[PDB]
Design a protein around this ligand. Sequence first.
Ligand SMILES: Nc1ncnc2c1ncn2[C@H]1C[C@H](O)[C@@H](COP(=O)(O)OP(=O)(O)OP(=O)(O)O)O1
Ligand SMILES: Nc1ncnc2c1ncn2[C@H]1C[C@H](O)[C@@H](COP(=O)(O)OP(=O)(O)OP(=O)(O)O)O1
Ligand SMILES: Nc1ncnc2c1ncn2[C@H]1C[C@H](O)[C@@H](COP(=O)(O)OP(=O)(O)OP(=O)(O)O)O1
Ligand SMILES: [Cl-]
Ligand SMILES: [Cl-]
Ligand SMILES: [Cl-]
Ligand SMILES: [Cl-]
Ligand SMILES: [Cl-]
Ligand SMILES: [Cl-]
Ligand SMILES: [Mg+2]
Ligand SMILES: [Mg+2]
Ligand SMILES: [Mg+2]
Ligand code: NA
Lengths: 719, 743
Amino acid sequence: LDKIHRVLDWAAEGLHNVSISQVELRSHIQFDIHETIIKAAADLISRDAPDYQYLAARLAIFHLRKKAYGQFEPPALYDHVVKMVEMGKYDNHLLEDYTEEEFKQMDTFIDHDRDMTFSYAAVKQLEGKYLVQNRVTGEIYESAQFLYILVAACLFSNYPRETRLQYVKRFYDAVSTFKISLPTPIMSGVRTPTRQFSSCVLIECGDSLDSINATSSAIVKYVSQRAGIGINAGRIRALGSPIRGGEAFHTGCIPFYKHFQTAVKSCSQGGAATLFYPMWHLEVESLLVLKNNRGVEGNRVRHMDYGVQINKLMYTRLLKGEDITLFSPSDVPGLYDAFFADQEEFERLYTKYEKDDSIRKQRVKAVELFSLMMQERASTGRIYIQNVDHCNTHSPFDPAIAPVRQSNLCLEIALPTKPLNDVNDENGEIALCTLSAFNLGAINNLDELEELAILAVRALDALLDYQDYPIPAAKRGAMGRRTLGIGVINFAYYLAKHGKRYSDGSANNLTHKTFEAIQYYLLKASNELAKEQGACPWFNETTYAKGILPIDTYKKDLDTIANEPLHYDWEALRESIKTHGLRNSTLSALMPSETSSQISNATNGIEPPRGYVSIKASKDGILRQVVPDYEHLHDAYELLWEMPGNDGYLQLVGIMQKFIDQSISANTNYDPSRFPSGKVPMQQLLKDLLTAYKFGVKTLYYQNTRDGVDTDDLSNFQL
Amino acid sequence: LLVTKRDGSTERINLDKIHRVLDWAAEGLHNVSISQVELRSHIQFYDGIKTSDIHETIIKAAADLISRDAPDYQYLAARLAIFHLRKKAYGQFEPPALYDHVVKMVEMGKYDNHLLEDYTEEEFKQMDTFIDHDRDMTFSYAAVKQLEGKYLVQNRVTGEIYESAQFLYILVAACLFSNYPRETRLQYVKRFYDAVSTFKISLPTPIMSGVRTPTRQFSSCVLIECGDSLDSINATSSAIVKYVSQRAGIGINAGRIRALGSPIRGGEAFHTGCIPFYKHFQTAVKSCSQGRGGAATLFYPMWHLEVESLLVLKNNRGVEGNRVRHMDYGVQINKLMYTRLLKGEDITLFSPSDVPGLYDAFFADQEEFERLYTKYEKDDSIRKQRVKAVELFSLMMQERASTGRIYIQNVDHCNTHSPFDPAIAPVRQSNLCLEIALPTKPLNDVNDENGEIALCTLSAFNLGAINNLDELEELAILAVRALDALLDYQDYPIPAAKRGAMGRRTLGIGVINFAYYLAKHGKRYSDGSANNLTHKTFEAIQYYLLKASNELAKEQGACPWFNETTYAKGILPIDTYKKDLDTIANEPLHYDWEALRESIKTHGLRNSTLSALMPSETSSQISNATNGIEPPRGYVSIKASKDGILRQVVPDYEHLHDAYELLWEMPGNDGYLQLVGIMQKFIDQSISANTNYDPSRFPSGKVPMQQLLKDLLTAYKFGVKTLYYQNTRDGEVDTDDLSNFQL
Ligand SMILES: Nc1ncnc2c1ncn2[C@H]1C[C@H](O)[C@@H](COP(=O)(O)OP(=O)(O)OP(=O)(O)O)O1
Ligand SMILES: Nc1ncnc2c1ncn2[C@H]1C[C@H](O)[C@@H](COP(=O)(O)OP(=O)(O)OP(=O)(O)O)O1
Ligand SMILES: Nc1ncnc2c1ncn2[C@H]1C[C@H](O)[C@@H](COP(=O)(O)OP(=O)(O)OP(=O)(O)O)O1
Ligand SMILES: [Cl-]
Ligand SMILES: [Cl-]
Ligand SMILES: [Cl-]
Ligand SMILES: [Cl-]
Ligand SMILES: [Cl-]
Ligand SMILES: [Cl-]
Ligand SMILES: [Mg+2]
Ligand SMILES: [Mg+2]
Ligand SMILES: [Mg+2]
Ligand code: NA
């Protein structure tokens, strides 16, 4: 009895508005036992008493210590590692790379009391998928600090003894205090005998059976490792196109899309993919309705998402109320390449081919085509936008040599690719990206990002050499460009604690300032890493190599929505990059973070919270999560459906994109009740779309619709 | 009034011109009425009416008069059509000289340019003298429609025809024998041309339509075995895509793929099931089809852990997640499975991954399979599921009945009676149509040089066109050599497929017009009256095929992988056949197999296999033959396609109507299955054997499961390797009753 009361007293230390009486009462313990107490505390998590999220977490942590060690106090780090290596749960390279004395020293870095800083949802995620445990019985073998210290130890294991343990302590401190947020594959895998860490894959399909086959094989290999897939299939020629003469005739893109879909789902009882194609593709009107609920199974491919690729010329046809001409890529020499790489050349070829009567083509009204796209985007939420000209005029890569011609599953990755002619084709290029994030809630000031960038960039860069590559074309891209994708979490909390909001423009200057610091320090870190270990082999293919920086090539319309000046010495950085190079071709990308950000109780990525308390279902109960410091900042927060429209948020995304190397998983959101007759007008959908383009937004991800066309009014619009 | 001639000029209407061409086409025909053809035409003579439209009206009228009482309208209409085609291609009835025709077509890019390299102008003059263009007048109307539809070189976006049938035949012959020495080349060309143009040898569609054109795509029959790995699954899928793009039929062995829930690497992961991979194979099959096209049969063992889920994949019920409806399936069975049924016992289902050695033994070693099977049944540590054999077999035959397209492969029969040593090159699957039986090996990559994809080149002897079995000696020589040359002639898009073809040089030569053949000999399917004749017939076929391939071996060398055959051991099909066949025939061997046995062991065979009995539903139409070994459905067959209603009458209905035995006049399947068993005694590969049932022959209009099972067991008893279609006419189980059965 009192043994339980003492643990409750212990877990409630330093908490406000929590009642041990209530936990006892709710648990019905008087009528294993500790698990019931944990759940009762978690069920008391609310707006009025958010601190229950820490009471329940600490009870849970206490329980896991006993479960793993038979006592609250963890064993010595060395004794733990030895035991786990023998059990085959840790990688045996740990005992070969580090001596017993070094494990003793690393143990002195460890602060096990930091386990008491997790929220309840954080502990459940750790227990659920991160902590090393028994496959079947679910018996946990470790605690959170052992995870953190060994992730740091593995990633910096090859560092010289002069600096190695110093880096290990730095990184361990950074992650265990939630300054740096690591993705799920790293949190679960690094320190274990696995080498599978790639979570997102970008594959470009060529217009041939061999490439379609290779692409399919590559998809299968990577979905079996539960990686998200980005597929460029826009090159595949249209239905009816001649083949060799034609000695045969093309039976269409859709049967090949269907084959890609069964590849994606081949290891699902699941697999997720986004497929990309140009808006002017001859089959586009058929491709746009592929997810539509009503139709024949023969002309539907519903279990993939799609990204429609658009440039300025397309939008211009819309604004002028003119036609868009559709072509098969096979019938228009140079057009596909120019679409991504050279806009004035695209316009030259496009108008030329439009006037050529010998070329198979179809004409549709731009209003009609755009409306069909946004109609399907609204009903599914899963028809995405890629502004391919923005992705190449404002890019780390020289589009003449390494154009960006697609994205990933979640539309934040922007990397070069090359089609494979065989699954083992050494001339192909499959884009991979290693991810992480800065927790904007946990940093005290922006200059703290200097060392954090050094730690984050070096840790991920070492992972590139550490991880394995199931496909040669994937290794080539990774070793060649060493592309990283570091983003942010807790942005909403960050804005709230600074008294700014999403929708009114109050955060425009702060956002400019914040993401200037992020990119500057990321670049500086990668530049210093290049001095020490050498620039990435294909650095010469970047705009950085030419002394071109993101501050040179951003969408100039940003100047009209923010006057925050640059605070860092970009001109000195410019010279140093041009001279010493970068270890990594890309550093930044703003991913969604709905899972990994739970560890630090962060708001998800750059998104506003839906509510003050989020309710999720889990393996063994319901998980409640309260936004950071609700107690003091509830009025400061701006919830998603409290925003009047998308303008404010889109302006912020544009401001971020000024500095981001890759792209951003930008959402659009609509509340039907905010409109007459409960219907979002097509005019509004198009306007926001145009707004996004105006401020340099590269991609549009989810369209969220809350569950509970005058072309003259767009004529004055300046793209 | 005026008609408009073909050259655009006008001319006064002259009905005598219509009468003349009808008179020409009716020459030698019986019971045809030119008056009736004229009356049936009701030609609406308006000013400017084209003679070409007049002629098409008259063709259709003649075609509409085709009936069992007046079958010769088949030929009246055909000759009128041939006439029409001569005009479209040549601007006159008489074809140009062969050399001038060939030069013109090569210039137009319609014929292969190698023709002009391999033969001089003089040699083309010589070949022209071989040609008899009047042989075009021997086609039936259905035949001409096939020629016009898919065989004659043409520009289909224009529609115009470029050649005639005898140019097709002569140049197929010229191309296939082009590499022969001048001492014998033109002699082979003439003999082969005569064989095909007089319908002695029937060639498959890829050859008829393609050989003489610039293409090298002729493979229409592909067998791919999938390994239990992502790499092989990917390779298999890629191989499927490549070959369906060439419109080949696919046989897929996916039986090795481990069951849903199976551990992987420990397991570090767990298997999500066969069905998602099957779905992937299906989209591969359909990848080059407008969303008809892309055809595959997928094979798996009866004892597979997921078999009950697999058997219902074509079922119209159920969610889309557990259905793969656009492929066919072949259930693999052996003696032990049937035995469990007879004794009313259980069958144990295993994932192939959980039973080391079982999968291989299933095909190659029945004794070892039985040892392993019972051992693993008694091992409680091995994941398994037990099901009543009655339940499992009933489910299978139920889905076979409802779809017609759940097939059976008796894998023990395929390996105990086989041209291949199962310890070296076992047969572990079949093809789309269940007559092919060849070795395979999984690929770990689409370009894997160590895998083996099975290919087969097909043809058939026309049993209705031969006058005695001894004619097969020369016909086998011609057929074997022509196909063997095609092996070196055609392309191979996948290395593993070239390996099998060059290594084994496997052929599949079958028959057409079997029903007509039985009728003219006064025999029938159902009463056993055809047993001895069938024995005599297929002994002659296999003997002469073997003799030809053996002589070809002496001349050009045995196939590289000949030592993997049972033939190389000195073993013949007459040594290994199902012994129960001794009870249903007493026809003695008429040919010297012992001398052949010695000759084969010394000089080998050019080809690892020679014979296989395919359906041949299209190629039979060319020679107006009854389809393969199947009995006719009726005296008159009808295809209501294209121009209108296309009718075809069985050969010589006039004299043999009472001699024919129609499919639905059969008391059952036993007579047919005995004949198949007798055929299989000599056939290298297998036979596309059909089962047939008329619900109205049974009480309450239901075909009893007891009967489905009895026929299944009867097939096995007489060594039948496979079962293809179950046909059900369109207009509960007692194991004690089955216990009597002797497998
Ligand atoms: N038989 C087919 N049926 C339907 N589509 C096909 C077929 N063959 C190829 N395709 C598709 C796949 C590709 O998208 C495209 C071209 O395929 P490919 O393998 O490159 O043919 P090819 O290279 O021999 O001819 P081409 O020079 O026209 O590309 O057409
Ligand atoms: N003057 C005519 N009056 C009525 N029918 C005719 C006449 N001339 C030809 N026909 C019929 C006979 C045939 O059934 C049909 C086509 O015969 P056909 O000889 O090919 O016509 P055609 O004379 O225009 O061709 P061609 O110039 O090659 O001789 O038209
Ligand atoms: N991630 C996955 N999800 C579902 N099925 C998978 C997955 N990976 C592989 N499979 C299937 C495909 C094969 O049928 C089978 C084994 O594939 P395979 O490529 O041979 O794995 P493996 O060789 O690394 O492990 P193992 O030694 O168990 O075969 O499991
Ligand atoms: Cl679908
Ligand atoms: Cl600009
Ligand atoms: Cl995440
Ligand atoms: Cl289906
Ligand atoms: Cl026997
Ligand atoms: Cl056929
Ligand atoms: Mg090509
Ligand atoms: Mg005439
Ligand atoms: Mg394996
Ligand atoms: Na593939």
